[PDB]
Amino acid sequence: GTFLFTSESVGEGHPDKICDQISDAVLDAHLQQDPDAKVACETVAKTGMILLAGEITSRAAVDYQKVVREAVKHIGYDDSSKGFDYKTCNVLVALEQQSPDIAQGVHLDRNEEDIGAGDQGLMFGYATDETEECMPLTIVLAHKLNAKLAELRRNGTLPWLRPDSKTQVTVQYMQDRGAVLPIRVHTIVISVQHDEEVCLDEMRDALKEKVIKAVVPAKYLDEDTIYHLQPSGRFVIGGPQGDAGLTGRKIIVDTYGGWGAHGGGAFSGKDYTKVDRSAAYAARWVAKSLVKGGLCRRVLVQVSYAIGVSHPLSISIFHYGTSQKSERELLEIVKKNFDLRPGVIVRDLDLKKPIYQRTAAYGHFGRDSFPWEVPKKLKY
Amino acid sequence: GTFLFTSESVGEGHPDKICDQISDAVLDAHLQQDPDAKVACETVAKTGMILLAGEITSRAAVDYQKVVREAVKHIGYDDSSKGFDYKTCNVLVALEQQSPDIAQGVHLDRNEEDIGAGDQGLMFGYATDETEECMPLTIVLAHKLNAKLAELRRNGTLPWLRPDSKTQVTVQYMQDRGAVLPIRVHTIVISVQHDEEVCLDEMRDALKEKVIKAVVPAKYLDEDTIYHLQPSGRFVIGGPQGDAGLTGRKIIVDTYGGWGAHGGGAFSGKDYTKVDRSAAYAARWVAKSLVKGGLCRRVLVQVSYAIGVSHPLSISIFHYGTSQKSERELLEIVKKNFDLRPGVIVRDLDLKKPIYQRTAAYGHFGRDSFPWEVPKKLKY
Ligand SMILES: C[S@@+](CC[C@H](N)C(=O)[O-])C[C@H]1O[C@@H](n2cnc3c(N)ncnc32)[C@H](O)[C@@H]1O
Numbered sequence: 001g002t003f004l005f006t007s008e009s010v011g012e013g014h015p016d017k018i019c020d021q022i023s024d025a026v027l028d029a030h031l032q033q034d035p036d037a038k039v040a041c042e043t044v045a046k047t048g049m050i051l052l053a054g055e056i057t058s059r060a061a062v063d064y065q066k067v068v069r070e071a072v073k074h075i076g077y078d079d080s081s082k083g084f085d086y087k088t089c090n091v092l093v094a095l096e097q098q099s100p101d102i103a104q105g106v107h108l109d110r111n112e113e114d115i116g117a118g119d120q121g122l123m124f125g126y127a128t129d130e131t132e133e134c135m136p137l138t139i140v141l142a143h144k145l146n147a148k149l150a151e152l153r154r155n156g157t158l159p160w161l162r163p164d165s166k167t168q169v170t171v172q173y174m175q176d177r178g179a180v181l182p183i184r185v186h187t188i189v190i191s192v193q194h195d196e197e198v199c200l201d202e203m204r205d206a207l208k209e210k211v212i213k214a215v216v217p218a219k220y221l222d223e224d225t226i227y228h229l230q231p232s233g234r235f236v237i238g239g240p241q242g243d244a245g246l247t248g249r250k251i252i253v254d255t256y257g258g259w260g261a262h263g264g265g266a267f268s269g270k271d272y273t274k275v276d277r278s279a280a281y282a283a284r285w286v287a288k289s290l291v292k293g294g295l296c297r298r299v300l301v302q303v304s305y306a307i308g309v310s311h312p313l314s315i316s317i318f319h320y321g322t323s324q325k326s327e328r329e330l331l332e333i334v335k336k337n338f339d340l341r342p343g344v345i346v347r348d349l350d351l352k353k354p355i356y357q358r359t360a361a362y363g364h365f366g367r368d369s370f371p372w373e374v375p376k377k378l379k380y
Numbered sequence: 381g382t383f384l385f386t387s388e389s390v391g392e393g394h395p396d397k398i399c400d401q402i403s404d405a406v407l408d409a410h411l412q413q414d415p416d417a418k419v420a421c422e423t424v425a426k427t428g429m430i431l432l433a434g435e436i437t438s439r440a441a442v443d444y445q446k447v448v449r450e451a452v453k454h455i456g457y458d459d460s461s462k463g464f465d466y467k468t469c470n471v472l473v474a475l476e477q478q479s480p481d482i483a484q485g486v487h488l489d490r491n492e493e494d495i496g497a498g499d500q501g502l503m504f505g506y507a508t509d510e511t512e513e514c515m516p517l518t519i520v521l522a523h524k525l526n527a528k529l530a531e532l533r534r535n536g537t538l539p540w541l542r543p544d545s546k547t548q549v550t551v552q553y554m555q556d557r558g559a560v561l562p563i564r565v566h567t568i569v570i571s572v573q574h575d576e577e578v579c580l581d582e583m584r585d586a587l588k589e590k591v592i593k594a595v596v597p598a599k600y601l602d603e604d605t606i607y608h609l610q611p612s613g614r615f616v617i618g619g620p621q622g623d624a625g626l627t628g629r630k631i632i633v634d635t636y637g638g639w640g641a642h643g644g645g646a647f648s649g650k651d652y653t654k655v656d657r658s659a660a661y662a663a664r665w666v667a668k669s670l671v672k673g674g675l676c677r678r679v680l681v682q683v684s685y686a687i688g689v690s691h692p693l694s695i696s697i698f699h700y701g702t703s704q705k706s707e708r709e710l711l712e713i714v715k716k717n718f719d720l721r722p723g724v725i726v727r728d729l730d731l732k733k734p735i736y737q738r739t740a741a742y743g744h745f746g747r748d749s750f751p752w753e754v755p756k757k758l759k760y
Pocket residue numbers: 014015016164165166191192232233234235236237238239242243244419420435436478479481482485498499687
């Protein structure tokens with residue numbers, strides 16, 4: 001019955017995650033002034049460069065230089081010694097209006113509740129009772145390891161740390177009628193950018209004692225646990241200088257760490273009319289509602305859309321054997337309790353509110369009691 | 381027992397897929413001259429612009445202007461009337477050497493078989509006996525609809541077609557002890573860029589009669605099948621002008637259409653040392669080998685790596701109940717039959733060969749008898 005499963009996470013200064021955070025800083029800046037902004041903002045990062053590319057139609061007046069640079073400052077890239085500096089980098093903008101053809105087919109002269117999906121696509125939501133926040137333990141731990149690195153960087157106790165980091169956690173599980181039960185942590189990887197002066201032994205000792213032990217309960221660690229700490233041996237070059245970043249290249253980090261499923265759409269830089277984001281948030285809300293409502297211990301939900309059509313084209317449920325009810329019954333409960341038109345999701349989940357930058361690191365789910373994390377009470 | 385499942389695909393001129401194809405055209409150009417090129421080439425596309433960003437260390441002399449423009453020509457963007465023209469677009473290059481820190485930790489002074497993984501990460505492979513090519517019917521059909529559009533564009537029979545397209549297929553399935561059995565097609569979406577002059581009725585009639593009927597067996601179509609053909613009502617603006625493209629933003633189209641699982645890594649623009657690609661190809665090869673070997677009707681395989689470490693950190697199997705053997709037994713068979721170090725995968729799957737541009741549209745799997753599609757005979 002035992003098996004392994006692995007998930008990863010990345011830090012706030014990982015170059016892909018820099019891009020997600022900038023894209024959502026841009027979205028939030030627009031929504032502050034124009035709650036109905038149409039935003040599709042991609043960010044690209046490489047040595048010395050942030051490029052914004054995409055489509056925005058908005059009544060807001062946004063200072064892209066300021067928004068981008070403040071986001072990079074917050075992340076911690078503030079000096080050439082770290083490989084990137086918000087004060088002196090290049091910010092390039094290639095932004096145009098939303099395509100009139102899209103606008104006319106999606107939202108122009110439509111009642112808000114009846115707006116069309118902003119694209120076709122498929123989206124999934126997942127929940128698991130293995131943690132209180134209904135997320136896989138593998139990714140929860142991976143996220144918390146990156147958060148701990150950022151904490152110890154910012155508080156000055158490990159001043160050799162830089163913002164770019166990756167972590168990976170392999171858990172050994174057992175199973176009970178489709179539910180999954182963590183036993184122990186099998187393997188941990190941590191790679192984090194560092195200054196020129198600190199040695200591998202100092203770093204590896206700190207990563208074990210001040211990072212892993214501060215995050216992972218001792219009951220999951222034993223003599224057999226495998227540690228790969230700074231396994232490349234040197235990580236001085238990092239951030240965009242080490243590796244180009246793009247928006248929407250951490251979509252599994254953003255969601256369920258390999259568990260569940262993914263329909264392919266990125267979240268960051270998009271307003272609620274882009275169902276890649278809004279319907280994935282709603283699908284998480286459905287899944288979590290089913291688990292917290294006691295109908296199943298784990299569940300996967302698929303939805304899909306056509307551009308210009310409000311109601312989903314399909315809805316599907318997979319409960320991994322963890323319900324007494326059939327998947328057909330659960331689907332009927334979902335259909336009776338939820339309205340997954342984007343123009344209704346926006347109301348239920350308050351998706352014109354400018355909170356998106358806070359979603360763009362450490363996962364969109366399982367945190368902070370965002371609206372999609374507050375179960376809906378079900379009637380059945 | 382019946383349920384719905386939806387998958388999508390996109391055409392060769394979809395702006396994300398343009399980027400994947402350019403990234404792999406660049407990879408192939410390098411590999412033609414230097415089989416050991418280290419390539420991490422991201423492409424970004426917006427109105428009038430292809431930008432290459434990333435890291436390449438290679439002995440090749442590559443003319444990026446020519447490689448990019450030839451790729452765009454092949455796709456079919458050859459005139460300002462279509463929204464994009466290979467002859468007159470801007471090609472910008474922001475390429476630097478691979479980070480020395482990565483190089484030293486991954487491959488420098490290492491025996492090829494013992495090279496380290498080029499990054500950490502997790503990857504999955506999937507196979508299903510529901511089609512002869514061991515792929516989900518949903519995505520096979522979605523891919524074939526896009527291929528049919530490109531065929532009828534190129535042969536001049538529907539000359540109003542442009543290169544940018546998306547399709548989506550919802551299939552109604554039943555199940556038998558974890559295997560899935562297609563019944564019928566529930567819903568089809570097709571959106572394709574078109575010229576100013578053709579009307580919606582002409583397009584919708586052609587899409588049903590010349591595209592859908594030429595691809596989808598009549599036994600799957602009935603009076604209840606739902607058709608969303610040009611559902612936005614107008615799609616004259618398209619390609620990068622309509623929507624920014626980036627490499628690695630169609631990773632579910634590239635794989636299993638929502639089925640199975642995904643570890644998050646993109647394929648295009650990366651040489652074999654990037655396990656995001658090589659280990660995903662190997663995992664597909666494993667999965668297909670298990671199904672074609674008669675050990676299971678469907679299977680999912682996870683692997684994971686640490687940067688600088690050759691052997692995988694974890695391997696896991698999920699057979700959906702479709703084997704008499706336990707997942708533990710299947711895992712033992714995999715471990716006895718496969719060596720998933722990247723420096724061995726490269727030999728088994730011939731991954732220095734410049735065939736990558738051919739993988740970058742219509743999915744990486746289930747086509748053309750690439751090495752990862754030729755089952756390995758198993759000993760057990
Ligand atoms: C290893 S790089 C990907 C491969 C890279 N594009 C290349 O040119 O080989 C991916 C991520 O790993 C991390 N990374 C960068 N340099 C690293 C190093 N020297 N050691 C470990 N991880 C590193 C960063 O988070 C980076 O975004």
